[PDB]
Design a protein around this ligand. Structure first.
Ligand SMILES: Cc1ncc(COP(=O)(O)O)c(CN[C@@H]2CONC2=O)c1O
Ligand SMILES: Cc1ncc(COP(=O)(O)O)c(CN[C@@H]2CONC2=O)c1O
Ligand SMILES: [Cl-]
Ligand SMILES: [Cl-]
Ligand SMILES: [Cl-]
Ligand code: NA
Ligand code: NA
Lengths: 382, 385
């Protein structure tokens, strides 16, 4: 692909492996799940899954069943013994294909309990089921009290019939990226209660797990049998409040770069881009970076996004357009085709994804995950 | 059946009859001009090839893309689009596939000497002449050639390449900065500069088939800016360029995309229960919550946290707290739709659902960004092909 000449997202799989390594050291009591949903947070699902497994991940996590099934179908195959879990299900989804593919499937509700049991019955092989507990996030889990009682009950019956085995009990935190937030302790308490209850009724899960990246990095009591450090595996800190990648032995995996399309002199008083929200203060040079919001450069970073060009940080001049944006180069005259580095690990003087997050009023998770399909991915150290 | 399966979670429904109607409506609105169907960025999220075909059927005689790869993909479509449709691309960088573009008969934009040298080199090596459009920077300060010496030199090099039989300048074009703000003084200033820079080029000897400057908001509001060709991108997808310009209905337009999902969970929760990351929403009393299985990886902007609208079970709901990567929650106020019930995030608006403009407002952006960044994990379903 000559598509890389315009722009590319370089994915350093050696950095990803080092991150997995570092996260395994940080959670020595637990298995590590490589969360590779959303096309591995924009980094490429299958290449990142292989690298994570090579570095010691024994679980893969996806949102949709289609994502998990694509991992099972990869050629050459990932090891047959890697566990693959998926959790974002709707009525009528491919439960039977998931059971036949030996996926761990999350169940938060009776409807899904019924459908997976029906699918196991029709497939003639038992399902592996994880029960999700809503411990305080108020999102995908089963509520405590009657809902949980009923769900645990139906799971035991299906076990009795040989239709499934409950392989895990899990939940997810709301505010683990704010250390000391009182909801963290409240959720852990509730997690302990709800899991104690399920085990006393007779469930025998292989894994209990609640930890995402910020809990993995800051709460050893929340590690249990399995940690799910998604954003950290891609070398990106969950928040500045938690710390920098370097604080945890982490290195950003993605570098986003483009080649300048145009370098041109313009007079003072010349408007730049839509709405003319920037006006040259005097005679100067403008550089055209051929990436825009269709490529995942957030429109919210208009006037603020940083980019390394020709030895200095520049910032976006005025509005980001669909396919491009402009920087004021202050008189410098790099060649057309010169490298513009939007973000990376930061060790060459370039910005990081967290700098973009700040410029766009969002979090670094969104920045890396929404880099568009029009930007080719280049895998290094595969 | 694998098709039938991903649509169960969510889908972006693309009504090509609405797109064809929009192209007809735009052609009425610019009777002096050919219409270019701007299908860059995967047709603003709607699907490049299906939209290109529909637009051509409805009378578009030009297709516009940003990258050469987009344009080459249109040339290569099977079945082919008509051989006589013109396909233009404009976002080039040094060393791009100029020769392949020349051999594929694309119109290629040039704003600079580097590019003039590369395309002339490629035409020389291919042994076939290039079709080149010169872009003028009339005030936008983005991709065009500046007036004065830069333009003089570019027009000069183009004439020499014409003299050698290496290319023909097929167009002279530009693009507006503020056409979405009617009466903004930059509009007239750019048109005046466009007229001068194009007059200059023609008097030096260039004979373009088309002159063009109009995007959607100019096409809709500025008949003097139509020239020989209009490029109404967002309007073709039935979306107004701004509320200042008007609503789609004001222009005989209908939104082409409908974004919908199937509820993944409906559950009862007590009062005082936090909802989603950071607990920016707390249930005020006992209630029901609905889980919509779409998140910012699917293109639901995180900026619409606490504000995005969605039609569920007969009423508009709004996002409760933070939108997550793969899902968000709504407070259903006690209602108990079935799991799997339809949640309509946006569409043309005639069934009581929100529009892409409502999402733009909720997310502090423009409707262009909403439709364009709907993620590849959302399948597109084409109706009225
Ligand atoms: C159920 C589940 N487990 C673990 C993770 C890993 O989170 P970290 O990436 O924070 O480690 C996530 C993803 N969290 C994303 C981030 O945005 N919204 C989500 O659902 C998730 O949804
Ligand atoms: C060169 C060019 N021509 C025509 C159009 C059509 O514009 P409308 O969609 O506004 O009709 C665009 C789209 N402009 C996109 C829209 O956002 N940013 C851009 O550069 C464009 O870049
Ligand atoms: Cl939850
Ligand atoms: Cl701005
Ligand atoms: Cl310009
Ligand atoms: Na929870
Ligand atoms: Na211009």
């Amino acid at each position: 692909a000559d598509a890389v000449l315009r722009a590319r997202a370089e994915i350093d799989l050696a950095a990803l492996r080092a991150n997995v390594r570092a996260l395994r050291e940080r959670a020595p009591g637990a298995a590590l799940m490589a969360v590779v949903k959303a096309d591995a947070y924009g980094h490429g699902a299958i290449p990142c899954a292989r690298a994570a497994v090579a570095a010691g991940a024994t679980w893969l996590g996806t949102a949709t069943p289609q994502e998990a099934l694509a991992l099972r179908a990869a050629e050459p195959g990932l090891p047959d013994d890697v566990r693959i879990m998926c959790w974002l299900w709707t009525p009528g989804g491919p439960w039977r294909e998931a059971v036949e593919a030996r996926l761990d499937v999350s169940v938060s509700a009776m409807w899904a309990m019924e459908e997976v049991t029906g699918a196991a019955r029709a497939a003639g092989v038992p399902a592996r089921v994880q029960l999700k507990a809503d411990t305080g996030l108020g999102r995908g889990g089963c509520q405590p009290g009657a809902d949980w009682e009923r769900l645990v009950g139906a799971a035991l019956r299906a076990e009795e019939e040989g239709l499934l085995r409950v392989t895990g009990l899990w939940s997810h935190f709301a505010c683990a990226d704010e250390p000391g937030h009182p909801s963290i302790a409240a959720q852990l308490t509730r997690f302990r209660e709800m899991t104690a209850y399920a085990e006393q009724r007779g469930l025998r899960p292989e894994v209990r797990h609640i930890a995402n990246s910020p809990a993995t990095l800051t709460l050893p009591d929340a590690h249990f049998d399995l940690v799910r450090p998604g954003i950290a595996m891609y070398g990106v800190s969950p928040s500045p409040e938690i710390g920098t990648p370097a604080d945890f032995g982490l290195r950003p995996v993605m570098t986003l770069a483009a080649s300048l399309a145009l370098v041109k002199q313009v007079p003072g008083g010349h408007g730049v881009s839509y709405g003319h929200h920037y006006t040259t203060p005097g005679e100067t040079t403008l550089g055209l970076v051929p990436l825009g919001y269709a490529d995942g450069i957030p429109r919210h970073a208009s006037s603020s996004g940083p980019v390394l060009v020709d030895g200095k940080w520049r910032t976006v001049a005025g509005r980001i357009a669909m396919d491009q944006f402009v920087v004021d180069l202050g008189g410098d005259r790099p060649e057309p085709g010169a490298e513009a580095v939007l973000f990376g690990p930061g060790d060459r003087g370039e910005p990081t994804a967290e700098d973009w997050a700040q410029a766009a009023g969002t979090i670094a998770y969104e920045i890396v995950t929404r880099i568009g399909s029009r930007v080719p991915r280049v895998y290094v150290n595969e």
